[PDB]
Enzyme design. Sequence first.
Site, mmCIF file in Angstrom:
data_model
loop_
_atom_site.group_PDB
_atom_site.id
_atom_site.type_symbol
_atom_site.label_atom_id
_atom_site.label_comp_id
_atom_site.label_asym_id
_atom_site.label_seq_id
_atom_site.Cartn_x
_atom_site.Cartn_y
_atom_site.Cartn_z
ATOM 1 N N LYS A 36 12.645 -4.776 -40.679
ATOM 2 C CA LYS A 36 11.402 -5.545 -40.591
ATOM 3 C C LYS A 36 11.606 -6.741 -41.527
ATOM 4 O O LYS A 36 11.695 -6.571 -42.753
ATOM 5 C CB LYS A 36 10.217 -4.688 -41.055
ATOM 6 C CG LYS A 36 10.037 -3.412 -40.263
ATOM 7 C CD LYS A 36 9.158 -2.368 -40.932
ATOM 8 C CE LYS A 36 8.248 -1.699 -39.881
ATOM 9 N NZ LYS A 36 7.167 -0.785 -40.376
ATOM 10 N N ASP A 54 8.725 7.886 -34.150
ATOM 11 C CA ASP A 54 8.422 7.424 -35.527
ATOM 12 C C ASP A 54 7.361 8.372 -36.062
ATOM 13 O O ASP A 54 6.179 8.178 -35.887
ATOM 14 C CB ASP A 54 7.945 5.949 -35.616
ATOM 15 C CG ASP A 54 7.525 5.532 -37.073
ATOM 16 O OD1 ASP A 54 7.695 6.326 -38.020
ATOM 17 O OD2 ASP A 54 7.025 4.396 -37.284
ATOM 18 N N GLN A 77 3.494 9.280 -35.212
ATOM 19 C CA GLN A 77 2.793 8.021 -34.931
ATOM 20 C C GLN A 77 3.193 7.382 -33.620
ATOM 21 O O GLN A 77 2.335 6.861 -32.902
ATOM 22 C CB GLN A 77 3.029 6.996 -36.020
ATOM 23 C CG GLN A 77 1.788 6.222 -36.314
ATOM 24 C CD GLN A 77 2.058 5.185 -37.361
ATOM 25 O OE1 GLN A 77 1.486 5.237 -38.474
ATOM 26 N NE2 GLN A 77 2.946 4.222 -37.031
ATOM 27 N N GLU A 126 0.477 -1.668 -30.417
ATOM 28 C CA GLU A 126 1.817 -2.010 -29.872
ATOM 29 C C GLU A 126 1.895 -1.834 -28.363
ATOM 30 O O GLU A 126 2.964 -1.698 -27.813
ATOM 31 C CB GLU A 126 2.901 -1.177 -30.526
ATOM 32 C CG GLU A 126 2.730 -1.095 -32.036
ATOM 33 C CD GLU A 126 3.915 -0.458 -32.734
ATOM 34 O OE1 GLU A 126 4.694 0.289 -32.079
ATOM 35 O OE2 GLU A 126 4.066 -0.749 -33.942
ATOM 36 N N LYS A 176 13.344 -2.348 -31.696
ATOM 37 C CA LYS A 176 12.034 -1.741 -31.600
ATOM 38 C C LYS A 176 11.045 -2.910 -31.595
ATOM 39 O O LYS A 176 10.738 -3.416 -32.680
ATOM 40 C CB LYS A 176 11.824 -0.821 -32.836
ATOM 41 C CG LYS A 176 10.426 -0.267 -33.124
ATOM 42 C CD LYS A 176 10.129 1.012 -32.411
ATOM 43 C CE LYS A 176 8.685 1.019 -31.867
ATOM 44 N NZ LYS A 176 8.442 0.348 -30.542
ATOM 45 N N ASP A 194 12.469 3.933 -42.166
ATOM 46 C CA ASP A 194 11.691 2.719 -41.935
ATOM 47 C C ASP A 194 11.260 2.234 -43.259
ATOM 48 O O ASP A 194 11.719 1.177 -43.729
ATOM 49 C CB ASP A 194 10.423 2.959 -41.094
ATOM 50 C CG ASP A 194 9.342 1.830 -41.270
ATOM 51 O OD1 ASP A 194 9.672 0.637 -41.658
ATOM 52 O OD2 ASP A 194 8.150 2.163 -41.004
ATOM 53 N N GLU A 212 12.389 8.240 -36.511
ATOM 54 C CA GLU A 212 12.042 7.296 -37.583
ATOM 55 C C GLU A 212 11.139 7.978 -38.588
ATOM 56 O O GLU A 212 10.222 8.695 -38.216
ATOM 57 C CB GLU A 212 11.387 6.015 -37.009
ATOM 58 C CG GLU A 212 10.956 4.903 -37.986
ATOM 59 C CD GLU A 212 10.311 3.696 -37.258
ATOM 60 O OE1 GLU A 212 10.730 3.367 -36.106
ATOM 61 O OE2 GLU A 212 9.362 3.083 -37.818
ATOM 62 N N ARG A 240 6.274 -5.733 -36.178
ATOM 63 C CA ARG A 240 5.202 -5.184 -36.989
ATOM 64 C C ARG A 240 3.969 -5.086 -36.146
ATOM 65 O O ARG A 240 3.822 -5.776 -35.142
ATOM 66 C CB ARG A 240 4.905 -6.053 -38.207
ATOM 67 C CG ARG A 240 6.110 -6.454 -39.057
ATOM 68 C CD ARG A 240 6.793 -5.273 -39.683
ATOM 69 N NE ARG A 240 5.855 -4.310 -40.247
ATOM 70 C CZ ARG A 240 5.474 -4.253 -41.522
ATOM 71 N NH1 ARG A 240 5.960 -5.082 -42.428
ATOM 72 N NH2 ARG A 240 4.648 -3.289 -41.908
ATOM 73 N N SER A 241 3.042 -4.257 -36.546
ATOM 74 C CA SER A 241 1.886 -4.047 -35.687
ATOM 75 C C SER A 241 1.151 -5.356 -35.376
ATOM 76 O O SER A 241 0.668 -5.625 -34.278
ATOM 77 C CB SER A 241 0.954 -3.094 -36.374
ATOM 78 O OG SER A 241 1.708 -1.913 -36.593
#
Length: 430
Positions: free
Chosen positions: A341, A240, A160, A202, A392, A316, A289, A370-371
């Site tokens: 997160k 990730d 991803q 992102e 991150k 994650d 990740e 987060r996105s």
Amino acid sequence: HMSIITDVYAREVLDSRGNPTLEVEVYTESGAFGRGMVPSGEHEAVELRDGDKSRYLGLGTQKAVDNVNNIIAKAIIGYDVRDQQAIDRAMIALDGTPNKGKLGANAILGVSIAVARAAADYLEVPLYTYLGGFNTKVLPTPMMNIINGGSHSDAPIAFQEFMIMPVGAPTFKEGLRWGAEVFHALKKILKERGLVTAVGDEGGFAPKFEGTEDGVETILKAIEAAGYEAGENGIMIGFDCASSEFYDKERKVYDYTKFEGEGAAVRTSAEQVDYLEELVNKYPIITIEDGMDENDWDGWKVLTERLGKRVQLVGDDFFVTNTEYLARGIKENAANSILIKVNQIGTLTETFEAIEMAKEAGYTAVVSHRSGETEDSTIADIAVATNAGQIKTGSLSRTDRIAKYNQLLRIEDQLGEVAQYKGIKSFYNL
């Protein structure tokens, strides 16, 4: 008394995807004021959505707002603003459910951040020091999303995110500079190659690459074009995989044909480790990740056994910023890192407990975003709060990311000669 919380108030607003979310604002008696915005992306604390398909495709957050104002407000108004922990437990108790489904972790977090930001304001001190006490010095070696695969890409790539890290830079300011300059060097390459330079959630690209190899290979090209080395003294890569995305639960395999098109390599747990191992040999990867599925414990165990000492391995979704799942990770030598997160767990306290627990296992707590992010920059302070050493918060475009990078530039400056940046030395798990 002046420290005391006299108002708590939520409203609906937008996150960086054009989806609602919420802010909470908290006032003290004294005039002190804080504003807690909430981000958004299975074992992960629930976020309340209206479900009303004729409002914002049922992603309204009025449910959440109405709970802050009509329930949480009354309970909390009254506490001293500085009782950060008394409050987080109040909300948790008040909610009563294990995964914060009654009030919703968006409601709760919102309040919780607001109160901290309010208390830091009350005491007229930065957020990181309120949160962290006096020994906050370390600026996080950031891991910057630069290329996208998986759901986000259409190219035949399953992993991803592909990231970078200025582990070799003396200061975070330079590190960011480095990071930016490559992004622009890559962006250039991508034009000369005739690939898409528009950016996803992102701020990274998601170009039509030939595949995973071409993907890395060009990130390296970029690094060199900028004029940096590709190693411990320069810039290094990370992934990730979000392997939980391309895992077939019934066949219990890593189905690459989902994202890389038919005639692509379907892999078992063992093969999956072997691929990642290949990658790591071949390349200067430093972090990975979700190398594995979020329920593939045997796999995780083996992966970490193999690369656990060469490469930082971050669970994650495999931990969801959650002590319960992480303690098991520690016990069974399941990762050597954790993605933190905050909304995944719901309050800052639980977030700090998580970050704490992880340090004492020799696990790095990677603070993440987060996105669906906001103009908020709390997490930046959280990485300095705990001297976590890592962060991150995305690519080098879109204020959703860059707010944090700036925020951290602020924190670097405010810390003057006190600030440190550990580059490669932030990997105390290696």
